[PDB]
């Protein structure tokens with residue numbers, strides 16, 4: 085059976101990770117990873133999370149199965165984070181939320197649900213996008229198509245080209261939007277631009293699908309949801325894949341959610357039952373620990389306050405690195421204006437380096453980035469900025 | 481899009497659970513659930529698990545992603561549990577193990593892997609089987625077919641009928657075996673019978689797929705793997721879906737494994753790369769906490785010793801309930817000989833009650849079992865045995 089199975093392609097993300105480990109050079113710098121890093125260069129457990137875990141250690145009396153859709157309070161808190169306290173969506177009971185193993189899990193559950201219960205045949209993703217999106221949808225049996233997004237000249241959202249491209253999208257197609265902190269470009273639509281896309285979406289007949297991987301990393305928790313909420317006000321139908329991997333630092337505990345919005349309670353409840361069917365045939369029910377940590381934090385005034393400041397501290401450190409990066413390149417003799425980096429949002433930023441410049445940065449200077457030129461800004465610190473920028477300037 | 485979506489069928493397992501909650505009667509007895517219960521009627525966290533969780537609370541410094549295949553030590557311990565310390569399979573490096581979200585997750589990952597990389601078109605499951613098997617394989621796009629198993633007259637393994645039925649299976653078909661503690665019948669093959677099926681499987685050309693949900697609930701950890709190991713000695717190719725839900729009491733943390741066996745290291749490593757691809761497009765990587773608890777326990781001499789005795793205590797309490805049940809029915813005037821219950825293994829047992837007897841037991845006497853007549857023996861205690869058996873005798 086397995087004699088002639090074709091190997092999976094190498095995978096450059098794991099390859100980059102392994103080449104970074106083997107690199108015996110002491111001044112090596114990793115900007116190719118997907119996780120947050122602090123001023124010391126590590127991915128720590130949040131203080132709020134540790135406190136939540138201690139409480140669970142002390143008060144859990146059973147590990148009996150969660151329901152297919154997971155911890156109710158988790159779903160309730162997730163819906164308030166996405167739509168806001170006073171949302172009409174929540175009030176009319178139009179939204180149903182499944183706890184899932186991470187954002188990826190939420191995308192996959194969304195994909196299986198649509199492929200098995202709707203007429204959806206294809207999904208539209210940005211160019212570039214996170215490469216995991218394509219694989220997830222393709223596995224459910226959905227075609228992936230690309231719409232234009234990145235203006236390579238101005239390091240901006242090519243908005244005219246984005247509209248032009250999506251006009252090819254038929255009614256009943258899914259169109260995937262990154263709620264905030266676009267991966268890999270860090271380029272987000274403005275509110276006016278979100279409102280325009282919301283309007284275009286309703287008349288063109290798209291099912292919008294929002295991927296929220298970094299809620300709270302752009303401007304703030306509420307601000308980063310504005311785009312979503314603009315779509316929410318316009319649309320009858322909507323899906324959201326959200327992740328707490330980055331904003332709670334719970335990557336390996338697989339904490340995410342799939343939220344289904346329909347016109348009314350009877351419809352959403354009926355659609356959601358088939359979404360639960362898609363979860364039952366996949367992993368049966370979701371993992372409790374990570375999601376229980378999140379629900380414990382968000383429903384407790386003290387822990388939430390502590391957590392929100394931790395998230396704010398991450399957001400601001402990134403924003404300090406963005407500026408320090410631009411100023412350091414400026415004063416190191418930068419063959420280029422990098423001021424666009426400051427206007428980009430969140431973990432990631434397209435540096436605009438060529439694949440050869442990137443490959444050279446690794447070979448000569450021990451600086452690791454992704455082939456596309458994506459850099460993780462959280463991998464930058466005050467200590468490694470000088471040598472990072474010297475390397476970059478030397479390859480321009 | 482969601483306007484005319486057909487609702488999912490009610491689901492009787494959740495329906496049974498909800499009807500049990502609403503039941504205001506004080507003497508109600510639940511035998512319809514899938515989880516272990518102790519003498520007090522609860523599903524507690526194991527002492528070994530709590531100790532493991534405390535150690536993790538104190539020593540974890542990051543929640544950074546696990547690899548796609550999860551915690552290495554977890555995989556190593558899982559392979560020793562399945563194949564044994566000195567196994568040649570482990571020595572020749574023929575087995576590769578992915579940590580997965582529960583046994584269900586392992587079945588789904590197995591299913592996607594086979595559907596996408598082999599010529600497998602159908603899977604053979606026992607009659608009856610756990611209904612989740614059918615849904616999982618059907619979602620990957622695989623036909624499910626049934627082979628005979630249960631001898632309804634003698635409450636035994638209808639072995640002649642089992643062989644006769646599986647002769648319909650073509651070469652290149654998957655045949656699913658329950659390693660031990662068959663769900664729902666509790667009827668396992670003897671070693672001689674396992675050796676016979678192993679032999680038949682190799683000449684007929686089946687890819688065997690083992691589902692281990694209750695390793696350690698029949699006779700012991702090593703004993704319950706004999707069937708698997710008999711197949712392992714004969715076969716070049718094999719898949720195992722194992723679960724730590726029941727034997728570590730970690731149900732909601734989703735702790736399982738998919739283990740792939742091929743002829744040699746180069747083949748298994750190449751096949752496993754595509755299995756990792758199937759995980760990447762599903763939930764990206766597995767949840768750490770539950771699997772970290774398992775790895776921490778199994779790799780530590782003290783905690784493992786404590787855990788093994790906890791598992792032994794569960795196995796023996798079940799075996800005491802089996803006997804108490806038969807003796808109590810005998811001395812309550814049983815219209816029937818229930819001695820077959822004592823020879824059946826693990827959590828579950830087919831009582832041999834009709835769906836009307838079951839429905840009547842719930843309506844009149846507040847005793848809850850599954851429509852098929854499956855009873856969870858761990859739901860029986862010394863306190864509720866008398867009233868349980870009185871109800872049963874009254875409906876025969």
Ligand SMILES: *Cc1c(COP(=O)(O)O)cnc(C)c1O
Pocket residue numbers: 118185186187188189214262267295296297326327328329330335339340763764
């Ligand atoms: C990091 C990231 C995620 C996170 O996925 P999890 O499964 O939640 O770890 C999801 N989507 C995007 C675009 C991301 O960048």
Ligand SMILES: *Cc1c(COP(=O)(O)O)cnc(C)c1O
Pocket residue numbers: 367368514581582583584585610658663691692693722723724725726731735736
């Ligand atoms: C209980 C059981 C399982 C457990 O599934 P998890 O996903 O590990 O909870 C798997 N297979 C069978 C036959 C079972 O009875």
